[PDB]
Amino acid sequence: STGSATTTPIDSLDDAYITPVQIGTPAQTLNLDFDTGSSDLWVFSSETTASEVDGQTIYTPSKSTTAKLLSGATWSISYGDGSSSSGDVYTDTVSVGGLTVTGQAVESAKKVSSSFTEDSTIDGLLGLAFSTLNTVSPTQQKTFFDNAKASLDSPVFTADLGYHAPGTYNFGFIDTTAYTGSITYTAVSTKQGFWEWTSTGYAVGSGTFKSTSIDGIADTGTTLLYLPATVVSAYWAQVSGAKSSSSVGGYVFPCSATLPSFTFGVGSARIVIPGDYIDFGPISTGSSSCFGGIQSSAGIGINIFGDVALKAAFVVFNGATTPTLGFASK
């Protein structure tokens, strides 16, 4: 089997991407944030504290003839920004782009933190990291991809995020029309439960490529590109007036600037992020200071190849017995 679903930016900045997912019988369609940096499929639901729902579409398990409470199971998760959610668990039928999993753990939110409430466009998350990170207790649950894998034509999914435009998540096959050149594959460590890999270096604009190993994670659920302070300083030094602002929380730059591109290495291959992808717009409405899309990882403890990087590539998440990642230009 295979599946194919369109993923759409939630706003004009590509702050996140939502993909429609069918849950239950009859189907209830929710728009979920596919997150290769976590491993829980959780949704706003009829159980979510009412004051914490503000426009999201909710899953109502009582209206699904295939929903079954997973007795005794609870979940609770905290994300990189300090946001969080928690609740109980059902199993139900879940379909993505024509690919159906029965008995998928659907984690029903009883509580969500303010950043989730305030984003009416995201009805939940669909985790695509390794199932060892799933937070369900006392019986850990498998991700949608893990549950589908044996049925797929090939044990893979691909992320093809758009720049200010829709893109695609495919399950079970590699669309050879979706990229240019060849896909370069690189080793993955699953020891932290992430799609963790080592980039071979970087270049800023038309500058020379610096060969240096940068370990990081391929994370569709993080907006920006977080890299070591040395790398990020080298990038923003090429932008007149750019500076790191503690009050804003990162590098900012004059909105009048034209940003240089940023290249990262995948083995001997190179992925080029155009400068426009690094512009995240005014820090507040009407400001002439703009927020940068490349930021320091120094406070985070890990480098993160988020959407800014991933959207410049066609990305293969290969879930074979020995997982690997593939990147192609497009």
Ligand SMILES: COc1cccc2c1CNC2
């Ligand atoms: C602080 O941010 C982190 C840190 C570790 C792992 C992840 C994130 C975001 N998604 C996965």
Ligand SMILES: COc1cccc2c1CNC2
């Ligand atoms: C992984 O996705 C995350 C992570 C943290 C906070 C938020 C999202 C989506 N909107 C708020």
